[PDB]
Structure formats: structure tokens, C-alpha cells
Amino acid sequence: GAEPYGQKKFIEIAGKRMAYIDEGEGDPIVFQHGNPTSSYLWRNIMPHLEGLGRLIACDLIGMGDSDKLSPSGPDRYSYAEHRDYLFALWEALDLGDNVVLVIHDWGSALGFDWANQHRDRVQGIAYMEAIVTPLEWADWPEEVRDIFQGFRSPAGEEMVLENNIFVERVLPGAILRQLSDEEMAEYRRPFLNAGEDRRPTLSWPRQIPIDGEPADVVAIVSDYASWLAESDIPKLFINAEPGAIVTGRMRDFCRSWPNQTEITVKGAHFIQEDSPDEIGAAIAEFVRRLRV
Ligand SMILES: [Cl-]
Ligand code: NA
Ligand code: NA
Ligand code: NA
Ligand code: NA
């Protein structure tokens, strides 16, 4: 269960190498990770979709085996910069117009935004522990609120760049099981060096739309949230118990979305590490249904 899935391919986008999985034939099934993960997140999910489509899992810029930006610093790895690289990669990959999106965390902001911009090219959306509408601090799990407000303060650089707290604390804190040393090492790999190599993992929490900031991301999220609440695009909502960011009022909101089926699995935030086989089977049933 610790082994990566497949063998990564590489494409140069805007002078940087992006790494991604691309296996199989047919209409794509696109799996997008978030913070502080990579395509690896999906390694026990993707085998359940074998033979049902072209399976794609991209590593965001500066993450996984994609190259780092230079010079890195606080103005880099914003949502929009990530979107520039990922959307370019998706274009380069010639996805066509029957794309299924499988999305999590910042992967869900990116994927929901993509779908909102390309409504005619998305066959269906499976999402989990996603950014579904703009947040307030009350929506955030109490037990990590102090850490997240830390990230979103000048203390963030020390917390992440020097102390790697997102990788070392937040990630295993939001997985119910204990990862193996080997799993751990894979997740740490892109961020082993203190300093700017760890930047994406600090830029990301600074982009979360909370209390109206950052405004640009709030607007992007509001836009797709309003669209999804009325859209007839097929959806699969994978709810988690106890879950983390899709709880309370946020969970009520996404449950109101049209043309959607839902499952519940055990998990906190990184639920792929806790309930892969249920997740995989639900996505396989959804894709089979859409593609019959
Ligand atoms: Cl984050
Ligand atoms: Na991915
Ligand atoms: Na992807
Ligand atoms: Na990216
Ligand atoms: Na980032």
C-alpha cells in the first residue's frame, strides 16, 4: 500500500518540468491532490479505475516531482500561479471533452474552477474534503485553528520553512491511521530541505478563503460555488466521518447540490489514506454509470 502507482511522465510548462501519471486509454479521469500532498495521495484509489478511462494525476508546481519555482518567496505559489501551471499542463495533455474530475483540498478549488471555466468538457465531478464555498474561522476545525492562524501570520515562515509543520504535524494529524515510515518519507521527499523548498506548503494556507481574504480566491470560490449549486453536472460527494473541512454548514451546502450521489467513509481530511477501497469503488461505480 506504500508503493507509488505507475511511472511518472514529465512535460515542460513555462520553463519548468511538471510530473504526472498518465496511464490507460479513453476519456480521462483526472485526480488532483492538494496541500501538502502529490499524485501519491491517490495511489490506492487509481487501481479501481483501471480500464475505465485514461488515468491522470498531476503533481502541482513545486510539489511531488514537479520542479520548484525560482526565486521562491512569499509572493510565489499563489492560487493563481498554481492555476497557471496546472491549467497549462491540462491543456497540453489534450484531455478532450468528457473529463471526470476527482478532487480534494486545493485540488478541488482548482478543479471546480477549471470545470466552471470549461462547463462543456466535464462529464462528472467526484469530490471530497473540498473547498466548496468561502469560509469563516468558525467553519475550521477548532483543534487546528491556532496553527492555521499561525500560518497566516508572520510566524508562518518559521513554522513551515524551518519547522516543516504542515508535513510533519498537520498531514499525519488529519489521517486516522498511522502512516508507515516509508509513506512518511515519500510525503517528506519534496520538502526535505529547510527553506524555500517548503514554500508551497505555506503559500497554500495563506490562500484559503477565510473571512473574506484573500479576496481574489474568495471570488473564484464564490463563483464556482454559485454555479455548482445550480448545475446539472453529475456529482459524487464523498463525505467523511468525522471529516474536517466539509462538516457543518459547509456540508449542508454541498449536500444541496443537484444531480449528486453521496457516500460516507471514515476519515478526517486526508481520507484517501483511511478509506481507499470505499472511495475507489464509489468513483468506479460513478464512472461506469456515466460512461455506459
Ligand atoms: Cl492549505
Ligand atoms: Na494529483
Ligand atoms: Na491531475
Ligand atoms: Na500547479
Ligand atoms: Na502553494
Numbering used by the authors: 5 to 296
Per the authors:
Haloalkane dehalogenases (HLDs) (EC 3.8.1.5) are hydrolytic enzymes that cleave carbon-halogen bonds in a broad range of halogenated aliphatic compounds, resulting in a corresponding alcohol, a halide ion, and a proton. The tertiary structure of HLDs is comprised of two domains: an α/β-hydrolase core domain and a helical cap domain. Based on the sequences of modern haloalkane dehalogenases from the subfamily II, the most common ancestor of thoroughly characterized enzymes LinB from Sphingobium japonicum UT26 and DmbA from Mycobacterium bovis 5033/66 was in silico predicted, recombinantly produced and structurally characterized.
The ancestral enzyme AncLinB-DmbA was crystallized using the sitting-drop vapor-diffusion method, yielding rod-like crystals that diffracted X-rays to 1.5 Å resolution. The structural organization of AncLinB-DmbA is similar to other HLDs-II subfamily members; it is composed of two compact domains, a cap domain and a main domain. The catalytic triad contains nucleophile D109, catalytic acid E133, and catalytic base H273. W110 and N39 act as halide-stabilizing residues in AncLinB-DmbA. The chloride anion is coordinated by two halide stabilizing residues with distances between the Nε1 atom in W110 and the Nδ1 atom in N39 of 3.29 and 3.37 Å, respectively. As it is shown in Figure 2a the enzyme structure is highly conserved (RMSD of Cα atoms of AncLinB-DmbA and LinB is 0.778 Å and AncLinB-DmbA and DmbA is 0.895 Å), however, some small differences between the structure of ancestral and descendant enzymes were identified. Furthermore, some differences are presented in several loops: the loop near the N-terminus of AncLinB-DmbA forms an additional small helix and another additional helix is formed in AncLinB-DmbA between α3 and β6, which is not presented in DmbA and LinB structures.
